[PDB]
């Protein structure tokens, strides 16, 4: 009946959304860290290739490794630019819009939870409309509904209650009077009229919305209405719901091309054709056949398999055992960490500088 | 008087906090972008130094340039690690805690704003208790209070209303009945008792807290009480969480992100590289490091580091690598991917020298 407290069909979908929004900051942290980690993996591969080229200087394999190093360094560079220009804003915006909406929802739900007169009459009722609900251990009537923002640790992004189309559980409600409102439970938050609702000497001036525009509480003796938010379009009285949906839909994760390796052959791999043109052919506009001829010299082919074969040689190359910890691995593919590999590269650059002096003086 | 609508002295301090929290995400975007920008500047310097070394093999300054390149590469590497491990969590946490608390505040304020019966009687009153207030642009009754999360662009946040000690405007209240509540305005949100408040057939069964625990609405015919939040220490936890997350922020200002102005031997990476690659010993005396540095830098002070950086910045690259009529000095070039491919060119030239020398 109009003007009565709200059964679980009304508030449980709001709890589900609230608990899912609580994971958006966790997913933002996961994605920002994943982007950095992937840049670091690109940089490690660039550094291993660079070190191989210094050790094996003056060979066709070393020239292949210069091409490999350039590829991976350009990927690391472009990934950092994408993290700066695109991912940071995507993830800050998703975190902020989700957390803001979660605060709007949680304040409303926490108000319903506390606005009760007894174990059988209040604003937040169980499934049947028999008892008011209570919060215990992060649940309300068994429903996960912490009504707090949890401590933030990285957690992989997911989507169940807020997805590409909208908020799955926030569907059109055709009979709020029977499915949302109880028959008996008293709740002045269910109405703006004065007899049973928020009005004192008379009705409120106008309808009142709550939970960032989700529910409309009329100033007359009639049931609430709710927005259907399951089929959203970019646009509102319920704008925070749209904002969080749009920001979440916009997320790519650390999964754009900068962050991923390529499997489309050598000439088309990032940086390769331009480096062959500029450093080997020393001409501005070459034909694909000329690129392929050069690649054959250094990779013995132009397919993924020949790139992988050079990468295996790089990975198998050992460094001097004094450059790593006692009893620690020395093959480049067994070493990781940017700062670690950077100083090994410096060692081999100084070896190259010294060998150059000996050979030319 | 108890059980009446709230005058502006009650809700305006909440608007001030809400407006300031709106900038916390702007500060997160600012700092994450600044960290990446600073890493990129370190990487550009590493690349310029590396290019100089590849070009000038045969001179002692080329070895100085290897040391310079290593220094900046290590700074870039460590900055990315700090962005990953430390700044990202700091800034996500500040964004989330501030935005969450702002949503709690704004839902409460927006309920007060709408819960009115006329132009002179409602839950959200002006300073004097004369008129109910209305939303007007980005204000409520003229007080900046958008009750929205604004579009995010990079900006450093103010710390006027949420600072190191707490929420400066949310002080202990000596007389809520007279200072927060009006004399006449009706407001069922001002108490939990049934005659004038939220109860229907009887009083609510307990006090109700609102705005993430800021205000406590008694279930009897009495004025609200509020938390003093101006002197915090590690039921109103969201206020604490936003305060601690904001004060924890360093910005992109830790050592990884800043250049060093002291001696050469104490610059990041330098002494270890001299020991490992030049002296080829696990331990060394400071004397010995200085002697090596003088061979390559002609000294060991910041002035000699600057002088090598000037040689690096003045070195031209081949015109075909930058385009017609474009600058050729390394110090006139910027952009990591741009400099990376120039380094690859000069590495290919080095390989061609060794192919004949060997």
């Amino acid at each position: 009946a109009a003007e009565k407290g709200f059964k679980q069909a009304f508030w449980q979908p709001l709890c589900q959304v609230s608990e899912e929004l609580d994971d958006q900051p966790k997913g933002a942290l996961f994605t920002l860290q994943a982007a950095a980690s992937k840049i670091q993996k690109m940089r490690d591969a660039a550094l291993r290739a660079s070190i191989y080229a210094e050790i094996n200087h003056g060979t066709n394999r070393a020239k292949a490794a210069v091409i490999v190093a350039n590829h991976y360094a350009m990927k690391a560079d472009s990934g950092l630019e994408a993290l700066k220009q695109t991912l940071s804003s995507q993830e800050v915006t998703a975190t902020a819009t989700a957390s803001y909406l979660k605060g709007r929802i949680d304040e409303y739900l926490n108000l319903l939870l506390q606005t009760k007169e007894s174990g059988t009459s209040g604003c937040m009722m169980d499934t049947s409309g028999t008892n008011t609900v209570t919060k215990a251990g992060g649940t309300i009537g068994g429903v996960p509904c912490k009504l707090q923002l949890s401590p933030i640790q990285p957690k992989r992004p997911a989507a169940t209650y807020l997805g590409k189309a909208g908020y799955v559980g926030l569907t059109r409600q055709a009979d709020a009077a029977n499915n949302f409102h109880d028959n008996d439970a008293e709740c002045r938050l269910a109405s703006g009229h004065n007899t049973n609702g928020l009005g004192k000497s008379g009705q409120l001036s106008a309808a009142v919305t709550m939970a960032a525009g989700y529910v409309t509480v009329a100033n007359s003796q009639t049931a609430v209405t709710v927005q259907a938010l399951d089929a959203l379009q970019e646009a509102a009285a319920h704008q925070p719901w749209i904002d969080a949906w749009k920001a979440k839909k916009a997320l790519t994760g650390a999964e754009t091309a900068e962050f991923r390796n390529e499997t489309a052959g050598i000439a088309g791999k990032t940086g390769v054709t331009k480096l062959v043109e500029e450093a080997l052919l020393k001409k501005k506009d070459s034909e694909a056949s000329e690129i392929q001829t050069e690649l054959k010299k250094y990779f013995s082919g132009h397919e993924n398999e020949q790139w992988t074969a050079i990468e295996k040689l790089i990975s198998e190359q050992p460094v001097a055992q004094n450059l790593v910890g006692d009893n620690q691995p020395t093959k480049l593919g067994e070493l990781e960490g940017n700062a670690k590999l950077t100083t090994i590269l410096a060692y081999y650059r100084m070896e190259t500088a010294g060998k150059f002096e000996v050979l030319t003086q | 008087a108890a059980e009446k609508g709230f005058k502006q002295a009650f809700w305006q301090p909440l608007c001030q906090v809400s407006e300031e929290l709106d900038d916390q995400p702007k500060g997160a975007l600012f700092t994450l972008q600044a960290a990446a920008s600073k890493i990129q500047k370190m990487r550009d310097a590493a690349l310029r130094a590396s290019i100089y070394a590849e070009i000038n093999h045969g001179t002692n300054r080329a070895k100085a340039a290897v040391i310079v390149a290593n220094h900046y590469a290590m700074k870039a590497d460590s900055g990315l690690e700090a962005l990953k491990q430390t700044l990202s969590s700091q800034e996500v946490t500040a964004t989330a805690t501030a935005s969450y608390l702002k949503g709690r505040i704004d839902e409460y304020l927006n309920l007060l704003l709408q819960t009115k019966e006329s132009g002179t009687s409602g839950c959200m009153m002006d300073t004097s208790g004369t008129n109910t207030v209305t939303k007007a642009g980005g204000t409520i009754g003229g007080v900046p209070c958008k009750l929205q999360l604004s579009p995010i662009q990079p900006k450093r946040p103010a710390a006027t209303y949420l600072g190191k000690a707490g929420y400066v405007g949310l002080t202990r209240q000596a007389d809520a009945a007279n200072n927060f509540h009006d004399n006449d305005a009706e407001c069922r949100l001002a108490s939990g008792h049934n005659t004038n408040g939220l109860g229907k057939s009887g009083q609510l069964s307990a006090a109700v807290t609102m705005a993430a625990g800021y205000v406590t609405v008694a279930n009897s015919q009495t004025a609200v009480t509020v938390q003093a939040l101006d002197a915090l220490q590690e039921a109103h936890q969201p206020w604490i969480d936003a305060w601690k997350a904001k004060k924890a922020l360093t910005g992109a200002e830790t050592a990884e992100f800043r250049n060093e102005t002291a001696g050469i031997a104490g610059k990041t990476g330098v002494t270890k590289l001299v020991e490992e690659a030049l002296l080829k010993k696990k331990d060394s005396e400071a004397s010995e490091i200085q002697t090596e540095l003088k061979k390559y830098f002609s000294g060991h002070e910041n002035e000699q580091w600057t002088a090598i950086e000037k040689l690096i910045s003045e070195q031209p690259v081949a015109q075909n690598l930058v385009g017609d009529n474009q600058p050729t000095k390394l110090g006139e070039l910027e952009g990591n991917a741009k400099l990376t491919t120039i380094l690859a060119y000069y590495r290919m030239e080095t390989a061609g020298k060794f192919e004949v020398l060997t």
Partner: nanobody, 122 residues
């Protein structure tokens, strides 16, 4: 996901002009070379701009008739079509190539739009 969205197509009379636009969403525009292809026949390269914006290339078929440009503030690449001919009727498709040269040749485009139809009436 990343999206490249073309617009501006339609039914146009031969001899005049038409501006196509392609807006990239979800992507760092400044990292990518941007190109226009068209498909009636097999798909063919029309025009391209390098990732730096410094070099622009055209198919022989359209050189001197079409121009291309990019606006980094709007994440948009444009195709300015002039001297429209019946043989220009096609679906026009936008493509992005990471750190690319703004050519066809060996390039592998990581992202593609769904296209905008241009129909030239004589």
């Amino acid at each position: 996901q990343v999206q490249l969205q073309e617009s501006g197509g339609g039914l146009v009379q031969a001899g005049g002009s038409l501006r196509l636009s392609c807006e990239a969403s979800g992507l760092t525009f400044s990292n990518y070379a941007m190109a226009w292809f068209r498909q009636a026949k097999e798909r063919e390269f029309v025009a391209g701009i390098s990732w730096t914006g410094s070099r622009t290339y055209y198919a022989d078929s359209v050189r001197g008739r079409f121009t291309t440009s990019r606006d980094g503030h709007k994440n948009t690449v444009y195709l300015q079509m002039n001297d429209l001919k019946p043989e220009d009727t096609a679906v026009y498709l936008c493509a992005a190539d990471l750190l690319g040269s703004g050519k066809d040749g060996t390039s592998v485009y990581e992202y593609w739009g769904q296209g905008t139809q241009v129909t030239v009436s004589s």
